[PDB]
Amino acid sequence: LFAGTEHRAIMVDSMLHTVYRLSRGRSLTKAQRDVIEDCLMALCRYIRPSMLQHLLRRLVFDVPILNKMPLKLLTNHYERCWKYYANFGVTSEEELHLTRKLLAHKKYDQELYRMAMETLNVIIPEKLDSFINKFAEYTHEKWAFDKIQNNWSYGENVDEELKTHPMLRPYKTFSEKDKEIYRWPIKESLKAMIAWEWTIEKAREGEYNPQPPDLSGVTLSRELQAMAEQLAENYHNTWGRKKKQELEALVPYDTLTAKEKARDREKAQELLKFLQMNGYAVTRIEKRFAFGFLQQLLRWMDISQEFIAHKFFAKILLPLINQYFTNHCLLGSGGHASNKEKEMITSLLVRHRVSLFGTDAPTTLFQHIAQHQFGDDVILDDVQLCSIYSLGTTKNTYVEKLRPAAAAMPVAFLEPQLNETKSPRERAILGVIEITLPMLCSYLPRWWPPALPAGAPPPCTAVTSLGNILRIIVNNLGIDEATVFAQPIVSRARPELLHIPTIGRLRKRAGKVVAEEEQLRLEAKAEAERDEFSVLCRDLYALYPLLIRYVDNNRAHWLTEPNANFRMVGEIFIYWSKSHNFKQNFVVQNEINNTLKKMLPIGLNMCAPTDMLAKTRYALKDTDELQNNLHLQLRWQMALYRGLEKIVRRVQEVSAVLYHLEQTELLSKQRRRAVV
Amino acid sequence: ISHTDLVIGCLVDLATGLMTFTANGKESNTFFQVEPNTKLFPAVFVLPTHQNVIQFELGKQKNIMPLSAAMFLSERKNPAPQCPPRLEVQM
Amino acid sequence: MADQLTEEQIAEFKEAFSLFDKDGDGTITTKALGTVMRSLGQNPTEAELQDMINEVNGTIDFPAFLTMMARKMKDTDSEEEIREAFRVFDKDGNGYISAAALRHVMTNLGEKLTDEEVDEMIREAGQVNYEAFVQMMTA
Amino acid sequence: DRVRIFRAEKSYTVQSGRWYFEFEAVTTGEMRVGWARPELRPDVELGADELAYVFNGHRGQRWHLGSEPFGRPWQSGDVVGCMIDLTENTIIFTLNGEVLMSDSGSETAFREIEIGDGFLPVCSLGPGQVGHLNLGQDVSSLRFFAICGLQEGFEPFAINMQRPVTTWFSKSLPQFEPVPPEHPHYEVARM
């Protein structure tokens, strides 16, 4: 019910603090604190992250430097994953703090990766006594300029209803009783500027309705803005140490609010502009993570060889998880590539997943050629260790698909692949005339292990480029028509069913469907009749064959309806009984899945309706009540369109519709603890 | 920051087409004169800066008839100020 | 209900209690209650000590001692019972119990649940895990 | 200036059946086509409030109470059909005869829409953009309706109308109007 509190944001800001004030304490048990820690994260949600940063400034002050503790880490991760689809610097400060911190070790990386997206003893110089009066005089010169604009009257006693300013005069017209309000402040700030950087000397010329001069004539440079940043924190350090001494007898500068830092910065931007007069000018994001990442990458491979010869390893595990986090969360491109080649030699699972991530995130050519040389050497060993090569055999193929989004060394491995985990060898393979001769060779083989592997890159080669691909599909057609490794065979099948040739494929696949239809009817006859498990096995094999069958049938239908909108009428009629047979058959199908039976009926529905619907409505009723004898027993706009063997064809489509129509179609409390 | 209400009243003389404007009973320097056969709508343009902004006051001065008699032909002789519901504020 | 403890604990408790019994009366001091639990290896801090005496004068009598011993061991067994309760479902013991293997283990346990409620148990909950199952049972 | 909003007259609302039209887009850019509630305010951006359902062809996203990416952006000279089926509370957008899908693969751009007072077709043209709106008087004048929509069951809009459907455009000339008493910011009081 606390959703959207733009009504009020101060009471909830105080309430959110005193809850976490009650989070750690001496006078509470495990039971009472678990109520509050569950009450806290229940309030971390159901409120907008506008008001969330009011405590997030206070948490990163306390927790992330130390390895109570989990109460911070829990509430943190439930807020940083609350907007990923000012305080940001505080988080990165905490991000490095947690890295400095890097059981309790596993309780940290989750919350971390979720956030991955002297003035009294200082001597005053000669001009510093002249600047403590001038920054007191320019302060009285700016204050009388501001108050009199809002109709501030002049009174001997300062009244608020009268807006009286009895200090409406200069510091040179003020005595020790009227300049004591600006004596210690302009002298301690000049002493704090001198104790920070010992430069108090005149090096430039100088610059009641008192008006301050144009002090904003020159802006802040790279050394002036840093000194103005040094003047705000020093004014916050002296006043902050004054608050820590007075209340004992608390907001910093860098982790200040967006509203608190707006009022504190005017005490330094006006003081450095007041110091700049009379020459007394005291003048002394992800790549940072990537720098430390490469810094960690150096010590990792150093330690990796230190164990290869025979604390940080957990930190390496802590980093790789964050590495897998940031890669998925995603000059600097080189730095990642530098780390990419850094980790690859260390391999020469957990890192490999991060390696697969980093390859998915996509000097190294030497590393590639050395790997390719190591691959062919392993291929020499394969023709004749295996674990370090097999993980490299997929990471390369990951990269070989990555860059698509040392040519000879690749070609050397290709011949080694052609020489002799056969499917994995067939996997990275696809990732001219010599191919053309082999193209007709497999075509002759289709006219009749390495036969499956050779067709992989051949599908990858023709796709890189018309009727040649049309021949390859027909070669792939008869190979399955004769027919496992049909799954990866089907993976390249839908990859290039783009580009007459379809009509030849239509005459081919119509035979493919009818053979499957006869195989379906045989199993249906087997279903009409131990032999029950065998029929279940046979249907499973039939479902297995139907899986790769319909997969090419879909994309081919994406051009058939594009064209014809005949042979498809046969193809609809053939696939009609298939869906009818699909209407225990699904039970074997579902196990084979662990669909295409549905989508086949979808594309065929448009074609079958392309060839009086009340009779179709009537014949659907008899098919929901054989009906072929019962079939024997806006329309002006429609007949304008439709005009632009019926007794069986109408009977054919009708039952298909009805099949598709069918296709689209307490305990008491003590009883619960009893059964437990 | 003024704690008082600037009241602006206008004066339109129909048989001459002469238009003048009074500021708190003190006549302003400006004036306006128009063609014979023309009409006019009373108008106020404002960018608001308060919870309560303006008030249209349909009143008469010491010897002149209010805006009710001007716009309703059945009541041209009545000097009592009225506001029937056909009158309203457009935008 | 003080029956949720077995006998030998009460045998161990009375052995511990009589060892630090003041005069054989069965009275002990407020401090000795902390020492006798640390004589039994249990180490709770003074927060878990403070709320227990005011739950029940400085004089702790043996039934007044024992009722606190029931509650300290009632809550701990109340949460560790339900993971080992899921252990008998899955053939491995991890949490992966198939839903097919449930509609005969649940109508055959002895609370006389018929087919309708073990249906009603299921469609108001493939294999389901354990932590959703301890959620759907405790409710 | 602003964006012009185009629609049909409020008599021509639909309450049932399944309907369809077509829309050629000549020069791509900022345009918007879809379906809208009849009580449509001409001040708002088309689809920002709860009165419109409208696809955007500049970057390929749907507009209703915000945005969500949807399908491919445009070319110069492609047909963007729209169709609705009130019997199932669905809205389907077809591009060039091919049915657009979501990021989840679903073709139905919006489901579970309340029928209410009805719907009526709506277009929107940004500055410079040119595109004609074939509302479907002559069936042969349509192009990609036979590819998709015909055998599905969708009838065109002006299937039996011997006169063309009158169109209502949003002006740019401001005119006076009485202040509504349910206005969220302004209110008057005749004392």
UniProtKB/Swiss-Prot annotation, chain C:
Residues annotated to bind Ca(2+) 3: 90, 92, 94, 96, 101
Modified residues (Phosphoserine): 78, 98
Residues bearing PTM N6-acetyllysine: 22, 91
Effect of residue 54 to I: In CPVT4; increased RYR2 calcium-release channel activity; not changed calcium-dependent inactivation of L-type calcium channel; not changed protein abundance; not changed structure; not changed thermal stability both in the absence and presence of calcium; no effect on the calcium binding affinity; significantly increased binding of RYR2; increased ryanodine-sensitive calcium-release channel activity; decreased of KCNN2 calcium-activated potassium channel activity; not changed KCNN2 expression; not changed KCNN2 location at membrane
UniProt superkingdom: Eukaryota
UniProt crosslink position (Glycyl lysine isopeptide (Lys-Gly) (interchain with G-Cter in SUMO2)): 22
Domain-level remarks: The N-terminal and C-terminal lobes of CALM bind to the C-terminus of KCNQ1 in a clamp-like conformation. Binding of CALM C-terminus to KCNQ1 is calcium-independent but is essential for assembly of the structure. Binding of CALM N-terminus to KCNQ1 is calcium-dependent and regulates electrophysiological activity of the channel. The C-lobe interacts with KCNN4 channels in a calcium-independent manner, whereas the N-lobe interacts with the S4-S5 linker of KCNN4 in a calcium-dependent manner playing a role as calcium sensor and gating the channel.
Family assignment from sequence similarity: Belongs to the calmodulin family.
Function according to Swiss-Prot or TrEMBL: Calmodulin acts as part of a calcium signal transduction pathway by mediating the control of a large number of enzymes, ion channels, aquaporins and other proteins through calcium-binding. Calcium-binding is required for the activation of calmodulin. Among the enzymes to be stimulated by the calmodulin-calcium complex are a number of protein kinases, such as myosin light-chain kinases and calmodulin-dependent protein kinase type II (CaMK2), and phosphatases.
Protein name per its UniProtKB record: Calmodulin-1
Swiss-Prot record, chain D:
B30.2/SPRY domain boundaries: 1-140
Modifications after synthesis and translation: The N-terminus is blocked. Channel activity is modulated by phosphorylation.
Expression sites (tissue/organ): Detected in skeletal muscle (at protein level). Fast- or slow-twitch skeletal muscle.
Note: Binding of [3H]ryanodine indicates that the heterozygous channel is activated by Ca(2+) concentrations 4-fold lower than normal. Single-cell analysis of cotransfected cells shows a significantly increased resting cytoplasmic Ca(2+) level and a significantly reduced luminal Ca(2+) level.
Family as reported in the entry's similarity comment: Belongs to the ryanodine receptor (TC 1.A.3.1) family. RYR1 subfamily.
Role this protein plays: Cytosolic calcium-activated calcium channel that mediates the release of Ca(2+) from the sarcoplasmic reticulum into the cytosol and thereby plays a key role in triggering muscle contraction following depolarization of T-tubules. Repeated very high-level exercise increases the open probability of the channel and leads to Ca(2+) leaking into the cytoplasm. Can also mediate the release of Ca(2+) from intracellular stores in neurons, and may thereby promote prolonged Ca(2+) signaling in the brain. Required for normal embryonic development of muscle fibers and skeletal muscle.
Annotated domain remarks: The calcium release channel activity resides in the C-terminal region while the remaining part of the protein constitutes the 'foot' structure spanning the junctional gap between the sarcoplasmic reticulum (SR) and the T-tubule. Pore opening is mediated via the cytoplasmic calcium-binding domains that mediate a small rotation of the channel-forming transmembrane regions that then leads to channel opening.
Protein name: Ryanodine receptor 1
Gene, per the UniProt record: RYR1
